[PDB]
Design a protein around this ligand. Structure first.
Ligand SMILES: Nc1ncnc2c1ncn2[C@@H]1O[C@H](CSCC[C@H](N)C(=O)O)[C@@H](O)[C@H]1O
Ligand SMILES: Nc1ncnc2c1ncn2[C@@H]1O[C@H](CSCC[C@H](N)C(=O)O)[C@@H](O)[C@H]1O
Ligand SMILES: Oc1ccnc2ccccc12
Ligand SMILES: Oc1ccnc2ccccc12
Lengths: 268, 257
């Protein structure tokens, strides 16, 4: 009933979120080992690539929900949208992205992800070009809070409503419980036009993960709880797949048991 | 022949394998075309065996990227010690080795097998058993007591013969010399400059014999090869850069018969 408390714990916890530690924990090897086809990184990129390869997900505007300090989730997307908004709750994540946008050396190096996306897209694109295009297409980086009824605030810059949403490992990671998760899904759904698509990636049955000193709390969800929430929010589920976390990728940075990928289309 | 003594490996690599010629992002460039020829050829599944020799390797490895997954024993060769050492440096992942990663990436890209570039380089480094001295002007280019397993199931050679031959007949002899290294039925992939007369390698100014596509064809036939394929890349203006005067690049797939 009372949402403020939980949301408050969440905002408090994320004050210690350390972008570099999170980058190290989830995007450096072994999880970041793009050479193993059976690994989670490759599975994620594959889900994204194949979905965009249908030609079915297009438009002018895309919004990435809770980008954090990562851009891989946009590698396959960025050829299908002119205008891309990135977003995060934390300024420090926003600056990280700033560093990559400016093509700075101190920036996290995504080039293995870029190359791998080029490889699986099968268009013989070099990664430098992929990166140049993503950089061109990211039109803004915005503060966001998915617990607000207007997640971007009122009279935001973002071209609304968007043609498509992307969101990876955000909702479940900032929702104390399932009902909060559902509301979070409801709030971002206001930003999507009817007939628009949502690509949702996330952890299955996770209760915690580490990002430096910060040990943050996650609502454990199942594939079925994810399908229901999507239906509940007004989506047709077009695709929902499950990756089971291999013991060797279960590194102690979290208690994640699997990863889900959902392609959902909002009812018009 | 004495000219090759001033040949600077890094200058040669700069002149030919760094941008603009080495910008792999442009599909119409010489780099991608070369890599395309190599990959398409091996993808046929018709060039295979246990052992392969790369003739006149210089300080470059890109010419074995697509090849290395069809041959378990690979021999690399060159006339200069400095080149052999430059190879050593990349094979052993020693410091200051040349960075071939862009090319590895692009072969993986072109090959379309979903292979990561690190796996590709790993396999290459593993299958290159030895780096050997060679002089194609010699009837036995490898010498007498070579560790190289003979005869080779296949040969590769890029930009060597024309660049070490004062004239057509020398070129022809050189081809004959390397052909004795190839098993009958075996395959040869020959890449090189068309209508080139000189190129620079730092302090070295090397003389080149200018050959035509049809001259290259006849040479292969005269050496007893059947020409399965011969393609020309015409040199765009923006890749004509003062380091030489080549007009085009040829690619030849020949079979000893
Ligand atoms: N109340 C809130 N509303 C929207 N995003 C939030 C939020 N609280 C935290 N976040 C952001 O949610 C992210 C979870 S980590 C996911 C990072 C990135 N999307 C990737 O795929 O790895 C963090 O970047 C965090 O700052
Ligand atoms: N007499 C000779 N016999 C065999 N190779 C020779 C030679 N004289 C010079 N070479 C080698 O021929 C090479 C020409 S350039 C290097 C070509 C390299 N394979 C690549 O594809 O770019 C030089 O490395 C040179 O050292
Ligand atoms: O790819 C990921 C990003 C963030 N968290 C993750 C947790 C488990 C497995 C993969 C993850
Ligand atoms: O790829 C090359 C290697 C050596 N010489 C070259 C001359 C012109 C164009 C390409 C070349």
């Amino acid at each position: 009933p009372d949402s403020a408390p939980g949301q408050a714990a969440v905002a408090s916890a994320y004050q210690r979120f350390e972008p570099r530690a999170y980058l190290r924990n989830n995007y450096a090897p072994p999880r970041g080992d793009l050479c193993n086809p059976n690994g989670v990184g490759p599975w994620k990129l594959r889900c994204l690539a194949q979905t965009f390869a249908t030609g079915e997900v297009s438009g002018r505007t895309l919004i990435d929900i809770g980008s954090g300090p990562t851009v891989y989730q946009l590698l396959s997307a960025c050829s299908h949208f002119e205008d891309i908004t990135m977003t995060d709750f934390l300024e420090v994540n926003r600056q990280e992205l700033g560093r990559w946008l400016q093509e700075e050396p101190g920036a996290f190096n995504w080039s293995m992800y870029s190359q791998h996306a080029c490889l699986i897209e099968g268009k013989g694109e070099c990664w430098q070009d992929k990166e140049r295009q993503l950089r061109a297409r990211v039109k803004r980086v915005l503060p966001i809070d998915v617990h607000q009824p207007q997640p971007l605030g009122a009279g935001s810059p973002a071209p609304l409503p968007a043609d498509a949403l992307v969101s990876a490992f955000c909702l479940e990671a900032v929702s104390p419980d399932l009902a909060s998760f559902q509301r979070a899904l409801d709030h971002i759904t206001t930003l999507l036009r009817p007939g628009g698509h949502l690509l949702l990636i996330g952890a299955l049955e996770e209760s915690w993960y580490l990002a430096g000193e910060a040990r943050l709390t996650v609502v454990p969800v199942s594939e079925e709880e994810v399908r229901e929430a999507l239906v509940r929010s007004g989506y047709k589920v077009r695709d929902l797949r499950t990756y089971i976390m291999p013991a060797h990728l279960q590194t102690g940075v979290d208690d994640v048991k699997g990863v889900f990928f959902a392609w959902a289309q909002k009812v018009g």
